[PDB]
Structures are given as C-alpha cells and as structure tokens.
Symmetry: C3
Subunit: 98 residues, 3 copies
C-alpha cells in the first residue's frame, strides 16, 4: 500500500513531524511521526502517522540516513511538495502547548 | 450501565492556557475517540493534576464523545477562548512534559 | 543503573539541547524524569549517545534522580541557559531509536 500525494501549499504548512527510527547509518526507516489538523497533509487526509516516508519530490528517503534526510528536508521546505509513503489512526486536533 | 471512571474538572483559567493537546484516534468519521494527548507543566490542566494523557475527552463545557475529528476542531477553536471557567469531563484510562527547548 | 553515561554537550556549536524532558508518576519525586524526544539540530542529537526514554540523573550541579516534577521545571528553567558546558548524566533505560528529523507542527 503506497500512495503519492500532491500537497496544496497555496491553500495551506505541512503539519507533520518526520522521524528517523534506528536510522543514523541509513539501515532504519523514516516515518511520519505526528500529523496536525490545519496543515496540507491533514487536508489531503490520506497520509497517517507511522506511515513510512519514501520520497519527497526528487529526494528518495527510502535508503537515506537521518543526517542526509535532514540536509534535503531543509532545501525542500525553504524553496509544490509531492510525498510518497507506504501505509504502515492518531491525529492532533488542537493544542495550546508552547 | 457502569463502565467508565468519569471525572469532571473545573479549570482555573484566571491564574492560568490549558497546556494540552487533544488527539483523535481513528476518528475521521466520528467512529473513534478523542483523547488527551500530551500535558505540559505551566498550564491549567497540569496545575489541577487530575487529568492524564490518554484519558478520553467526553465533554468540554460541548459533547465530544460521539463527534468526528473535523467537527471537534471547529468546536474547540471557538469554545476554549470564551470567558469563564473551562470544564473538562474525561473518562480515566488508567508522561507530563516538564521542559522543552525544541523550538 | 547498570549502564550510566555522562556527556558534556558543546553549547558553543548549538543553541539548544533540542530535547523535551518528561516526568512519569513524579508529582512527589517518587517517579522518574526521562528524556522525551530528541530533535536533530540540537546538541543532544549531535552528541548522539542519549536516547528517548533514558532516565535523567543529573544536569551539571543538580541531582534529578528523586526530584519532583515541579522542582525539576524550576531548576531546568533556572540553569540550562547559564554559562558554560552542559553536563547530562542519564541511565540507559531508553530505546526505540527514534529521533525527530524535522517538523513544522506549531
């Protein structure tokens, strides 16, 4: 179960955290950690927390280490976002934690 | 029936933000549940001390028990900032954030 | 407590520890204080030795092993931004291998 999703970054922030799991050397995985209502990801509805992040546009995350993922994610966010994930459901509705 | 341990808490918003997140579990269509996610020291909920992460949110002042995620978002936006005490009713389900410098 | 580590963080290079700290059953100091989450870009991630779920024992001069949540909040706010090195001592009770790489959640 893989889905590729184009994010609407005119109407909407992504509203997610991205987490690395035992992936310092790239032998782990990269996952959607959390999703918050109000962002582009929640708007689309198809991505879920714990889904495995496979690609963001031209960046292939599937076999990437944490640091290399961090490198490319800064270039992607501060410069459309198309995300591919493997499905593998908790969602933040509201928060006033600082 | 008798099936949950329910508590109702009147928060002190004079002295205190709530300092919580509210999460939906499998609840895009209202067939899931709405729970207390995390609780941060410094807010009203932590000050009171009775509500815990994972407690199921039943009512705020608004009935949440059988509400969908999106319908809850709408309601929460407009109810938590209204004047007065805030009253949370939760079903007890059996970590409190102390400090974070993550921006 | 069979496996304790002490790490000196380089707060020259990094502006923040990049962690959360949580208390479990610790309103009266009878529980534990733990590393919650760890974010890339902070000094703790850069060091790499501390893991979520590791138990916080000491921060510089302050013993955290049997401190109440409320007392811990005050101390961390008082001391973490003070001059010089930050020395963290943890028991390796943690695991799961999770590190936050990025987030735009407010």
């Amino acid at each position: 179960n893989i889905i590729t999703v184009t994010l609407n970054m005119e109407k909407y922030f992504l509203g997610i955290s991205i987490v690395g799991q035992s992936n310092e050397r790239g032998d782990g995985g990269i996952y959607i950690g959390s999703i918050m209502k109000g962002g582009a990801v929640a708007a689309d509805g198809r991505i879920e927390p714990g889904d495995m992040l496979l690609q963001v546009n031209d960046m292939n995350f599937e076999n990437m280490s944490n640091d290399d993922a961090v490198r490319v994610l800064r270039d992607i966010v501060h410069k459309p976002i198309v995300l591919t994930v493997a499905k593998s459901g908790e969602i933040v509705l509201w928060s006033d934690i600082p």
